[model samples]
Target chain A: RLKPTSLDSFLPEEHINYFRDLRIGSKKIRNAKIE
Target chain B: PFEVVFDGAKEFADLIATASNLIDEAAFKFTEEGISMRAMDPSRVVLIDLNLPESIFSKYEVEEPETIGINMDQFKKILKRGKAKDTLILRKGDENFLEITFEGTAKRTFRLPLIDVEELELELPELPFTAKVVLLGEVLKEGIKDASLVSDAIKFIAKENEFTMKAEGETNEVEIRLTLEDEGLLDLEVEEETKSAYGIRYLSDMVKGIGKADEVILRFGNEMPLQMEYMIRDEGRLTFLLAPRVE
Candidate 1:
């Protein structure tokens, strides 16, 4: 039997932001704002 | 108070149009620095993350941070009304409405109701991508079109210096192979050979609104999620994550 895997099922929740902040040589848009 | 203006309405409008394809409603967070939005599709198969800094706007003013919930479909309809050269203004109105003003030959203002959208903290998934392919948006667009004609799912294979997209149907098959010699293949790097299959419809919808001249960065691992990134006219950046079809 073959089972299909989705991101939610395959990846752990803590690893989501791994690529969110990955910048590739682009200049910063502006100053960061703290929450 | 929140108000922003764009000199070229079409660019912003087109970005929203592209996002609307995957999400019906989204919560746009406006800060002193810029605007950012992140949301996943209904099926959880795709996620879109967008960011536009204050520098991108012709005029950006915000007294405080605010999260504005909007219906993407309706907002896109109003954005479509503006011409490429028109000036677009977005302002907060009466706590419950968002004012959209388009300034072209004739000035037009439309009031859009603010809906209550439950905000979800969505994060981009981390994957050990073994292959990175940078190519022209038009090239990927053509490959998607070619694959769609033959099958619902498209298989991607990347080797040392080559990338291929293949789709096999019951009676017909299509393959688009790009190598270092191809002008459209700007860059290709692979740690190891990788192959994955994904739904072609999602791929088609993802690149539908991008300009032909724009460059798109794609990264993936064997049977892992695909990450696509592209610039939004130097004003913003849009990233998409799509899950793979595993057998």
Candidate 2:
């Protein structure tokens, strides 16, 4: 469970894209049916 | 001729600039001591009282006590051109404009027209507050911004040893907590558990000028008006009285 944190202690806007490196389906797809 | 020169150019310009956000015109009374102003926003939801004593200025000269009405919007525009390191000079020019000059590497001058605002006698009603606290301005500024992301109104709670600000929107909720032992808290006095809500939009605008202050004094009462004061030692002070939301 995500813990509640104080406003200042929480995530700041500058670090919001920290997890952007994790690209999922954007790469070459596997055997998924194409639209 | 009434004239005042201030060495703290940044603070002086920021004060009028911030005040202009809530009010259009303000009447400043120049006296033997210094200059004082009392005004309310057009909606009458907030009242601002400002005092800039003679001690704050390098030079202050007033032959007689005069009430000068200034259009704050235009004055704030002039202040934008002033640099923080510069010196600010204000003198009465003719009978129409308030001559403002900023002394930096290049001296710049601006002439702002003076207008007449309804000279309404406004008395700040004293309220018996339940809780009062002095905390760093950055803490309050951050809390207000956090609450803004949630709702337009923010709730204030003062307990025995903690001060908390909370806001609830449709889905998200925000709460900023500060304890008496916190490094940012200078003082905390609570008579009883007090809770109230205020319009965040108004407060956001009111605190714009005070953010430069190292610390701010906040007084809260149960369903009463909220008062925030920022003092600059011998420079004088700015006090804001904002009524709570009726929700």
Candidate 3:
């Protein structure tokens, strides 16, 4: 976690944990709608 | 029943915002006060205790005390997609399912699925907290972010006089000092000097979403959980309690 010079430098610890607690829903990432 | 509503994603953003700063495989305790997260760093000086209050909601109502488990990632996704609605409803589904539905301009929705989260009864045991101070969360968080670039651990020394964050490595070390004489964000300063080491990676994770916070209360003891409390919402009390690694 560094000083916020820009949003790109922003990294929330909760965000990292959020990614960890993620579970694959009925929809898979590969099947996700492509933009 | 009084149902108050906000105009945007304040509460939703607030919770998901802080949750994003948490580490993996860590236990999150939901209590009457709010959400409590306790983790440890590699060095041990920077102990983090994060808390989010229950009364910060646009509306508040309760018939009983309950605990609900949830997947942080899934919860976060819903939060990320939520809009700034006029209403963010705090719901009790299936008795213990704590969720939110954002109702505003677009009527977007977000919720956390209930889980078999066993409640953790914390008794506090005992702590040697001798010094405490209230400082800016963004300032300290920024400093920790800088220290992480060098190593995995940092040192925090707090006494009645000042508070310092230090990260030392084989070649060099980075230490950020926030003192009474320092002109940034030091509100209240007390006595009692102690230092410990902590993990920078863990510290970095919790530093996310904290930049918006105005202040963070630091409670310290020798080689103990560094208690950090922030006030973000209405009477909102969020804390981060992280243990330090014995260096």
Candidate 4:
């Protein structure tokens, strides 16, 4: 539950939701390397 | 098949250059709608998310979706030769590389070998943060610089009417105070007082986008990670999350 900025209106709601969704799975790849 | 062309090559290059600080290589997923990327630092202390819409490009064509792995170091190096007004062309080349062409006074093309990265799924943390602050980019950048001069970790404290940053060393300490009414302070909301310490190195890298943004959004819970969001023009948004340094 967070407030949105005026610019947030330009972005789709689902785009904002991506942040919460991605962070939830971040713990699984804490030490991952991409080369 | 996918191809993206843009006249504002410098802005595109700048975004990738900043993202390169967090991860050397990442997959750029190209969709019919636009292009998107997300990557975490090797230390897992920070993550960067980027999104750009098709409308941002001067010419965008995509028949199907594709993910192109990029070595940011090389990508940035090649982009360094591009002029700000140069038109950038990106396309899949052959089977192992991506072709980039910069159209300016002189046409230049660079072929970059692509790598295969293990597909990693990420989920965003739903933190019930107690404080949120909208601040000018320079304020955060300058404060972090002041704090870094004294220590590696910087503490952020958000009170009812002000947000503060503090750093302490064996012989020196630094503190920056910004009230809700400050010119650089765009907005402030604190249900409860909150403070968190974050690694200055990561914070510095994450805030590099500040140059392109007038304001930045900062949110955090006590001892939780810091979430910083910036508007990337009208095309997309850039968001970063850096874990707190717990003692």
- Local distance difference test, per candidate? 0.77, 0.70, 0.54, 0.72
lDDT of 3 at B77: 56
Q: TM-score for each prediction?
A: 0.80, 0.75, 0.66, 0.79
Q: Categorize the docking of model 2.
A: incorrect
Q: For candidate 1, what is the TM-score?
A: 0.80
Which ranges in model 4 have alpha carbons more than 4 Å from their true place? Answer: A1-35, B118-125, B233-235
Q: Chain A TM-scores, all candidates?
A: 0.24, 0.20, 0.31, 0.36
Error of 2 at B195 (Å): 1.6
Could you arrange the candidates by TM-score from highest to lowest?
1, 4, 2, 3
Candidate 2, residue B192: the lDDT equals 95
- Candidate 2 local Cα displacement, residue B18, angstroms: 3.1
- Top-down DockQ ranking: 1, 3, 4, 2
Alpha carbon lDDT at B103, candidate 3: 70
The CA lDDT at B159 in model 2 is 90
TM-score of predicted structure 4: 0.79
Tens-digit lDDT string for candidate 4 (B1-247): 5778988688778767766677665567777777878765544556677878888889998776776656566677778777889999987844756778888798888776666543333345476778999999889889988888898888899999889999988779999999976888989999999987887878888777676347899989887777898875555778887777654
What are the runs in model 1 whose C-alpha is more than 4 Å off?
A: A1-6, A10-35, B93-96, B103-108, B117-125
For candidate 1 chain B, the 10 contiguous residues with the lowest summed lDDT are B116-125
Q: Which of candidates 1 and 3 is the stronger one according to DockQ?
A: 1
Q: Which 10-residue window of candidate 4 chain B scores lowest in summed lDDT?
A: B116-125
